[PDB]
Amino acid sequence: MLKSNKVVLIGAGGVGSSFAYALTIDNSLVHELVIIDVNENKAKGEVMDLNHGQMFLKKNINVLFGTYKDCANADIVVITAGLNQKPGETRLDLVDKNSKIFKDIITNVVSSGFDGIFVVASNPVDIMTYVTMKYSKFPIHKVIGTGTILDTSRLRYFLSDHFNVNTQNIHSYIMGEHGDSSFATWDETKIAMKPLSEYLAEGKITELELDEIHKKVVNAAYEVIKLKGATYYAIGLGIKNIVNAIIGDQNVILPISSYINGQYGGLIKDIYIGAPAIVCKEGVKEVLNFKISPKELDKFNSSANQLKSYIDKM
Amino acid sequence: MLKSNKVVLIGAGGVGSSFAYALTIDNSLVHELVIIDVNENKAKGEVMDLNHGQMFLKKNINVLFGTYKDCANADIVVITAGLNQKPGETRLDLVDKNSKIFKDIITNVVSSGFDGIFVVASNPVDIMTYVTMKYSKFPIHKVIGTGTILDTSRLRYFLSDHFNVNTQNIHSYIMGEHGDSSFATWDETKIAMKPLSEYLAEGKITELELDEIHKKVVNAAYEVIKLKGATYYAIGLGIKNIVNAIIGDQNVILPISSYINGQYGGLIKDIYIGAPAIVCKEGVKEVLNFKISPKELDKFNSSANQLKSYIDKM
Amino acid sequence: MLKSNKVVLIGAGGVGSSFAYALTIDNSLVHELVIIDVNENKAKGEVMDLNHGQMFLKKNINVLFGTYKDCANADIVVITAGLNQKPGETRLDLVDKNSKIFKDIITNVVSSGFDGIFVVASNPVDIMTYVTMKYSKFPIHKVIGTGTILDTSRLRYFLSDHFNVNTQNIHSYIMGEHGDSSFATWDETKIAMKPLSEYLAEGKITELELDEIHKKVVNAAYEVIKLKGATYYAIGLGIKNIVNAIIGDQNVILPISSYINGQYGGLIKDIYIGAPAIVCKEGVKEVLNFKISPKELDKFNSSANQLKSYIDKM
Amino acid sequence: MLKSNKVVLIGAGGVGSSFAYALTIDNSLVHELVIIDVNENKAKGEVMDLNHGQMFLKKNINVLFGTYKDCANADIVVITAGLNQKPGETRLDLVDKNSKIFKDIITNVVSSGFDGIFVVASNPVDIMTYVTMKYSKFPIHKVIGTGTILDTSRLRYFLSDHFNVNTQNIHSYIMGEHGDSSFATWDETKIAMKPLSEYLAEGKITELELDEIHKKVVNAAYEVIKLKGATYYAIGLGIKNIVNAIIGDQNVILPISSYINGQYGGLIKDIYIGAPAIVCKEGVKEVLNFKISPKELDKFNSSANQLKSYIDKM
Numbered sequence A, B, C, D: 001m002l003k004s005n006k007v008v009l010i011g012a013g014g015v016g017s018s019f020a021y022a023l024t025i026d027n028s029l030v031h032e033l034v035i036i037d038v039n040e041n042k043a044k045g046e047v048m049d050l051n052h053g054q055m056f057l058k059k060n061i062n063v064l065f066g067t068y069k070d071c072a073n074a075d076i077v078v079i080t081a082g083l084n085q086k087p088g089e090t091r092l093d094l095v096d097k098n099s100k101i102f103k104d105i106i107t108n109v110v111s112s113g114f115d116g117i118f119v120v121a122s123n124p125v126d127i128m129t130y131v132t133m134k135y136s137k138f139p140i141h142k143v144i145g146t147g148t149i150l151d152t153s154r155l156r157y158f159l160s161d162h163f164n165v166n167t168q169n170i171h172s173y174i175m176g177e178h179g180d181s182s183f184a185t186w187d188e189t190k191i192a193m194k195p196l197s198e199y200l201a202e203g204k205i206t207e208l209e210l211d212e213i214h215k216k217v218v219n220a221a222y223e224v225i226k227l228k229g230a231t232y233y234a235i236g237l238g239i240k241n242i243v244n245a246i247i248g249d250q251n252v253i254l255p256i257s258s259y260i261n262g263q264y265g266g267l268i269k270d271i272y273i274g275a276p277a278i279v280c281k282e283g284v285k286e287v288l289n290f291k292i293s294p295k296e297l298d299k300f301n302s303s304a305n306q307l308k309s310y311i312d313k314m
């Protein structure tokens, strides 16, 4: 029989609100969208503002103010709650703050009876995916993090503007930690079928500009925060696409926070890191295994070791 | 010869940014979006955040930070700049400040050689539309204000929730000044082909409940501002829809800020007010005229007299 | 847990194939589409042609050759099987022949354990909807026919071309039999908020031009059959919208083949006929009832009495 | 100022009508669609059938029956007119017949004053693209053929079913003549960024399976023709995607009938053949030049030799 697909959103700030907006505009069958925030006034205001535009939507959608009661029968739970760049300094203190919040949130969600899929966006996304997995006891393939999807989006925009080519034809990935230790898969990048190495040999692009594009990908968050306070639109679209791919059972490969256990180096094991995986109706279907050049394998290993280091502390 | 369609957005606040985001998601052929703001940092940050999500869009779109000089060959100019009102404030009050702002903006735009269509969202929207028309000396059919489209969307959502029927089947308008003096076309309202009067007879809705819905429509702005600082999602969708109807040459009737000079009894003439008009590629094709209940006509004339009072102060 | 929505198409002719194509293009999430035809080569070929274009679709979709075995776990069964009307042949001339086909189809379907929703398009659509309900022994809310949705689309196109106004703003229905006994709700018709009587008064349209539009609606099928043998595009879109409205649980009012037993004066009861009804996740939520002019009521009763003259012979 | 975009379709058969249907459903702002056919009755019937479903479309669009005089101000001309291969008809016979038909069509069109873009689909599509360019005298960049876009779509569907992965991650081309002398770019294929080589090593696929996939791609046309008479859905979607890429100025790379004179070793020059090119508002912006394995270059040169000989005959 036909069912009502339910998505609960925990965290009604810039990122969560942007995701909800984009989802109401472009919906792949999300019958009910439930919004939860510790600041209940903000959640109620967002629910009202999103409902007031139903007349302009292609489809109608039930946007509801919610409590954790609502997670019992939910099909997806999207977490965007946290302290976006808090004041005390230190990203280890950030991890502590946000994992403290996640303890509470996850306990409430699991005590509700929820048995769907987690989609995690709160920073540091990889560590918070790990924390969600452990605090919840869910299977690893029911816990997803956005990982390097936003970094990959930025990378592909930079390459599209460089070559003046639709992002549709830009086949490159950012992998590793969603942060400063990320790396681009330069050696495996293609523009449509044309390898990047041919573009280098023909002089359209140089290794210098590749270094600069990567530095740009890494500095984009800081640039945008300086310019406008926060970043939410691109990540909102990424979250929306993950959700639509899940509910669409599209078997699509995405650069998400993936749990690796031998893939790539046979060295990196037992953590969530930015990597390509198949997404479908049940969550993660497969963590893809492919060879990366030695340079990029060393970068991957260093990134995973940085992640292990930050986990160890707490 | 195929053309590149250009929209210049002036005012990169909540409303303008929401409209730009929605437009990038649901794009009816806008090839170039130029974002202007007296706060250059905010415009640049919004441009970067909007471009970093191209990968997730149906179609790539060129988004630019620009300056008034870009209005020269622009096809549409959307103005969302000004003061946005806060607790204990109204819309009919930010009139002299916002009119000065519009003087400056319009002078710059027209000086650049622009000759396209103005789409005005800033408040008080009817008054600012009249101001745009007279400062620009453009044809009146090239000046569109958003009018009562947001009020109408809210009304239709409330009626949809009451009857649990898709908004598509809700045929009702809010008319008059976008604000406190507005009214609903209760006596002309239908659910599909079923008159609202029949629902009243059947006891499925009450007169008191209609008055409740109208008070909710009028107080929605104050509610949502109290709850989350400002409204911007619904109005962003409405602006997106107006822009797409223009570029698409869709000949669609919308309740916008329309110039009346004889319609609805001709008691009040030569002002912009919330009323239905046909929108097309060239701007406003017609401002329609239909008979409304006598009580509703009295309400309409009261609203128009308030507006004309504020305008005659000049 | 999330679900795979399944639609089984029975009848891979022009109408069925148009519906399948349109659905693959504009897919409110059918994860699986099965195509059944007594001419199995035709079904195989259609399946292949539909799958060969997956690269150009927004979303992938599994299109399968199947048999009645596939109806067991089907969420929706669309029936487009039957006999086309030949030149000089009315829809009702098919009653006998097609009735026999349905007896077989409905038999097999019911034997597989299907307990979803029927969407009936084969002609004469109202009588075939009644026959489906009687053979299947299903609840009346689980059997839907397209009724006068196609005639209504035609009426709205003709009015949109007369007034040069988007079909969005054309609020008029064709009701009664999907055939030569249909009528238009001229007295209840409105263009946005503006009644049709006001256009008549202003001379923007004449009574005789309304009669001409009705005659054109009635004779559209015969004209198109003469010109190219059969119609399938418009009805393809109509069925597609019905299906997406069901799966989307959109609670949308549509002029479908609705079961009446007391509505519209109760002078004829216990038939299916073209009338407005709410569509949602599990079929028909409610068959509406509104008051229509006495002449229109005489026409409605004539049509209903014709349809019952046929149903009584059964 | 804003322009109306005009597409003129010559040939209202299966392919042209499917393209028109798909375009009305998924419309990147074609304001006017004009359908021309020597068989006036068929064109009129299709115009009526497409118009009768406007109420179900996301956007309204003026679909009109017309004559060659309408090409004067057309922005795109899509030619689907001509015969398809029959049993015992070689590419040579089809070339003869369809080149005569194109003589007629191109003469009429150019006499009308048309100065837009040609999109060619009649078979053999590479030769007919060359012939359109030669007869019209238009620039090379203003004459586009569908090339191997359909064979590429079929290839990617087959790989998507085999690897059970979204077509959106299947990076592989069919190149050469749109026919039996086509070949797959096996040695440059990647799923996401896992080379097909790696899939072969692990036994996930075999060489015989690749040969059978290429055989299926080459035989699909005959199979579907035997099964249901003709193919037209997939190529309809392909033509629609090309038209929307054009009007959208999307700068997208597609495997179309591209004019080569140096690329791929430059052994054969001055022909249209299935190859990747950037599509934009002005037509073909650039014909790309990635380089391929020795096997595949031998195949490509054989195919180009075929085409060039058939051309030199004339």
Ligand SMILES: NC(=O)C1=CN([C@@H]2O[C@H](COP(=O)(O)OP(=O)(O)OC[C@H]3O[C@@H](n4cnc5c(N)ncnc54)[C@H](O)[C@@H]3O)[C@@H](O)[C@H]2O)CC=C1
Pocket: B010, B011, B012, B013, B014, B015, B016, B036, B037, B038, B039, B042, B080, B081, B082, B083, B084, B085, B101, B104, B105, B120, B121, B122, B123, B125, B146, B147, B150, B178, B230, B231, B232, B235
């Ligand atoms: N139905 C409607 O039409 C509605 C109208 N609204 C009004 O829209 C306007 C914008 O609202 P918000 O975005 O929420 O407020 P906001 O402060 O977040 O944004 C206003 C923007 O305008 C900028 N600005 C000011 N002057 C100029 C100038 N001369 N040139 C360029 N930019 C300038 C300013 O820097 C700011 O970024 C306000 O007047 C609102 O009252 C808001 C809600 C709905």
Ligand SMILES: NC(=O)C1=CN([C@@H]2O[C@H](COP(=O)(O)OP(=O)(O)OC[C@H]3O[C@@H](n4cnc5c(N)ncnc54)[C@H](O)[C@@H]3O)[C@@H](O)[C@H]2O)CC=C1
Pocket: C010, C011, C012, C013, C014, C015, C016, C036, C037, C038, C039, C042, C080, C081, C082, C083, C084, C085, C101, C104, C105, C120, C121, C122, C123, C124, C125, C146, C147, C150, C178, C230, C231, C232, C235
């Ligand atoms: N509701 C509406 O508005 C309209 C109703 N239409 C009717 O829809 C029906 C189909 O029309 P067309 O597609 O043009 O005709 P068609 O000949 O092209 O296709 C009908 C299909 O039904 C097949 N069929 C017959 N019996 C069975 C069976 N037991 N199981 C499976 N398949 C079977 C048959 O092989 C054929 O392929 C006709 O009855 C039309 O009169 C057509 C147009 C619009």
Ligand SMILES: NC(=O)c1ccc[n+]([C@@H]2O[C@H](COP(=O)([O-])OP(=O)(O)OC[C@H]3O[C@@H](n4cnc5c(N)ncnc54)[C@H](O)[C@@H]3O)[C@@H](O)[C@H]2O)c1
Pocket: A010, A011, A012, A013, A014, A015, A016, A036, A037, A038, A039, A042, A080, A081, A082, A083, A084, A085, A101, A104, A105, A121, A122, A123, A125, A146, A147, A150, A178, A230, A231, A232, A235
């Ligand atoms: N994964 C990515 O690519 C990426 C992109 C941008 C930033 N982020 C991060 O994700 C989060 C997004 O934050 P933001 O930009 O929306 O800032 P924000 O402050 O506007 O939103 C954070 C929300 O979390 C709420 N919250 C706090 N504790 C809560 C609790 N126990 N339960 C429910 N809600 C609670 C807060 O009330 C607030 O509304 C941050 O951690 C941010 O650093 C993710």
Ligand SMILES: NC(=O)c1ccc[n+]([C@@H]2O[C@H](COP(=O)([O-])OP(=O)(O)OC[C@H]3O[C@@H](n4cnc5c(N)ncnc54)[C@H](O)[C@@H]3O)[C@@H](O)[C@H]2O)c1
Pocket: D010, D011, D012, D013, D014, D015, D016, D036, D037, D038, D039, D042, D080, D081, D082, D083, D084, D085, D098, D101, D104, D105, D121, D122, D123, D125, D146, D147, D150, D178, D230, D231, D232, D235
């Ligand atoms: N990937 C591809 O390129 C591909 C795929 C399928 C078939 N085709 C080809 O497209 C063309 C149409 O295929 P079809 O299946 O629709 O066959 P069809 O017979 O159904 O349609 C051809 C149309 O062209 C019309 N026509 C003939 N001569 C004309 C003239 N001088 N002026 C105007 N119109 C004329 C005919 O009236 C007919 O309607 C064929 O050449 C076919 O081989 C393209």
Ligand SMILES: [Ca+2]
Pocket: A160, A161, A162, A164
């Ligand atoms: Ca550039």
Ligand SMILES: [Ca+2]
Pocket: B161, B162, B163, B164
């Ligand atoms: Ca309710």
Ligand SMILES: [Ca+2]
Pocket: C160, C161, C162, C163, C164
């Ligand atoms: Ca007209």
Ligand SMILES: [Ca+2]
Pocket: C209
């Ligand atoms: Ca006339």
Ligand SMILES: [Ca+2]
Pocket: D160, D161, D162, D163, D164
């Ligand atoms: Ca498979």
